[PDB]
Design a protein around this ligand. Structure first.
Ligand SMILES: *[C@@H]1O[C@H](CO)[C@@H](O)[C@H](O)[C@H]1NC(C)=O
Ligand SMILES: *[C@@H]1O[C@H](CO)[C@@H](O)[C@H](O)[C@H]1NC(C)=O
Ligand SMILES: *[C@@H]1O[C@H](CO)[C@@H](O)[C@H](O)[C@H]1NC(C)=O
Ligand SMILES: *[C@@H]1O[C@H](CO)[C@@H](O)[C@H](O)[C@H]1NC(C)=O
Ligand SMILES: *[C@@H]1O[C@H](CO)[C@@H](O)[C@H](O)[C@H]1NC(C)=O
Ligand SMILES: *[C@@H]1O[C@H](CO)[C@@H](O)[C@H](O)[C@H]1NC(C)=O
Ligand SMILES: *[C@@H]1O[C@H](CO)[C@@H](O)[C@H](O)[C@H]1NC(C)=O
Ligand SMILES: *[C@@H]1O[C@H](CO)[C@@H](O)[C@H](O)[C@H]1NC(C)=O
Length: 346
């Protein structure tokens, strides 16, 4: 007595009504308090087909985050195709919160417990809950920040591996720490990553990729070209939009189980030059948004890289190249909603 049906979900959270952070402000009025303790209804001898690439839940989280940003991060100017809108854009407290998406009465959620599950195909080990796990609505490109990790090995997720245009989602099993700071140029910043740990990472990832390719050379290169939001690792820190140059990060070749990288510094750490931008291209809609100059003081963000977004170059020899990607924030949420599927208890 179960199948695949579309329904309108609601969110829950441990948001605090006294906190002036926008994620809390939005949540307390748009979400239900956490259960906060439902239970996993485990199932045996049952197999279902999940498809992280065609899932309503994602579009639903998409609209909410968009709404969340509409109330929270209001641009000074919003230019959309010739027309412009001005409005108050106060500086504010910004720091994402875990968001559990829940199913209404009559419906439930199916959870794949296969720790190797790639996001598509059958799943011989399922379960049941009313709400998903806490998901921080983190908007960023190239690198997935503050997500969950793969409990076992590194998983590679793509709607189609042989179609170089389909986005590759690498789910890391160990997190790489990243620290972006704008020290006391006012719009200048930088992010630090420990090479040795970024090295281990890309080797494991390199191998996991090799297992999906005819032992060709596997090179990593900076994004070919396009908007700054995509050609760079961009994200939001305390309300400020960081655009961090990643050309010293995705720079190395890994063939024959070997690992070789480029762009290091004395302390043995990779540094990324960043700019805090006022003019950005919106991820919510096709339109440009203009914000106020950066606040004062140390603007620093300490995050954990838990996944990558890649893009093979493909082409109609002996060398496959991948470049950082992103842009379509839906991918940022398939990487956390791959475990879930809405079902009708009907
Ligand atoms: C995921 O596993 C399915 C079989 O269950 C397979 O067809 C598909 O190629 C796999 N996807 C990736 C990207 O590993
Ligand atoms: C992390 O995942 C990679 C997948 O390639 C694996 O080689 C490594 O042993 C994993 N570490 C664990 C199991 O903690
Ligand atoms: C994967 O992508 C390739 C290249 O676009 C295409 O020829 C093939 O039909 C796709 N496979 C599936 C399962 O859609
Ligand atoms: C980064 O990776 C290279 C190649 O594996 C390694 O030799 C190097 O020691 C690592 N980082 C540093 C600076 O130790
Ligand atoms: C990143 O920095 C390098 C060296 O300064 C530069 O060549 C490259 O164009 C930068 N990337 C972008 C798109 O800003
Ligand atoms: C890799 O990084 C090095 C060191 O910054 C740089 O000189 C080189 O052009 C980069 N290679 C690319 C862009 O693939
Ligand atoms: C990532 O999570 C940490 C820990 O809560 C937080 O301090 C940091 O601001 C987050 N980074 C981003 C990009 O939101
Ligand atoms: C960041 O990653 C480290 C290392 O795994 C972990 O100890 C810490 O809890 C993480 N912080 C957050 C808030 O994800």
């Amino acid at each position: 007595v179960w199948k695949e049906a579309k329904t309108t979900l609601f969110c829950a959270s441990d948001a605090k009504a006294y906190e002036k952070e926008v994620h809390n402000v939005w949540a307390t009025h748009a979400c239900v308090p956490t259960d906060p303790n439902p239970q996993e209804m485990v199932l045996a001898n049952v197999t279902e087909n999940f498809n992280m690439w065609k899932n309503d839940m994602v579009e639903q989280m998409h609209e909410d985050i968009i709404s969340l940003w509409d109330e929270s991060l209001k641009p000074c100017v919003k230019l959309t195709g010739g027309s412009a809108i001005t409005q108050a854009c106060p500086k504010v407290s910004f720091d994402p919160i875990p968001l559990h998406y829940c199913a209404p009465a009559g419906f439930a959620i199916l959870k794949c417990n296969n720790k190797t599950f790639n996001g598509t195909g059958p799943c011989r080990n399922v379960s049941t809950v009313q709400c998903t796990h806490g998901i921080k609505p983190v908007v960023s490109t190239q690198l997935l920040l503050n997500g969950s990790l793969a409990e076992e090995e590194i998983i590679i997720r793509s709607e189609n591996l042989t179609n170089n245009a389909k986005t590759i989602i690498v789910h890391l099993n160990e997190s790489v720490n990243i620290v972006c700071t704008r020290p006391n140029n006012i719009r200048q910043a930088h992010c630090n990553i420990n090479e040795s740990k970024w090295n281990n990472t890309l080797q494991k990832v390199g191998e996991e990729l090799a297992k999906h390719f005819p032992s060709k050379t596997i090179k990593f290169e900076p994004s070919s070209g396009g908007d700054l939001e995509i050609t760079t690792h961009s994200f939001n820190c305390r309300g400020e939009f960081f655009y961090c140059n990643t050309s010293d990060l995705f720079n190395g070749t890994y063939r024959n189980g070997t690992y070789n990288h480029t762009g290091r510094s004395s302390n043995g750490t990779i540094t990324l030059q960043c700019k805090i931008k006022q003019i950005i291209n919106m991820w919510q809609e096709v339109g440009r948004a203009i914000y106020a100059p950066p606040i004062e003081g140390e603007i620093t963000c300490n995050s954990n890289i838990t996944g990558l977004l890649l893009l093979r170059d493909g082409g109609q020899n002996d060398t496959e190249t991948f470049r950082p990607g992103g842009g379509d924030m839906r991918d940022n949420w398939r990487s956390e909603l791959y475990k879930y599927k809405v079902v009708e208890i009907k």
